Structure formats: structure tokens, C-alpha cells
Amino acid sequence: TQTQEFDNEEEARKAEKELRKENRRVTVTQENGRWRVTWD
């Protein structure tokens, strides 16, 4: 469990699609904006 924030270039969505193929699981959360993808 590790909070990694990304750009607003939408490479957080790329990171969802990419890191899932290697990392345990990523959790994309734009709570009040700010693409905070917490990967395990």
C-alpha cells in the first residue's frame, strides 16, 4: 500500500492499465481531483 499521485496528462489511467500487469493492484482515486493512484 503506497500512495502515488500522477500528472493531469491522464498517464494515471495509463498507469492503471500498465502497473496492473506487474504490481499487486493499483487503486485510482481522484477524490477532489488530483490523480492519487495507491498501488500495493
Side-chain angles (χ1 to χ4, degrees):
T1 305
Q2 183 73 214
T3 57
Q4 181 60 90
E5 67 191 294
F6 289 87
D7 49 75
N8 191 31
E9 181 64 274
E10 192 178 271
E11 310 306 280
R13 302 292 299 254
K14 173 177 173 295
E16 188 284 288
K17 192 182 186 180
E18 183 171 86
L19 304 177
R20 64 180 296 150
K21 305 184 178 304
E22 185 181 276
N23 176 263
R24 177 64 185 210
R25 183 175 296 196
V26 303
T27 301
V28 56
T29 304
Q30 53 175 332
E31 176 187 90
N32 186 265
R34 185 184 179 198
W35 301 93
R36 290 181 287 167
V37 185
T38 305
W39 57 271
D40 186 66

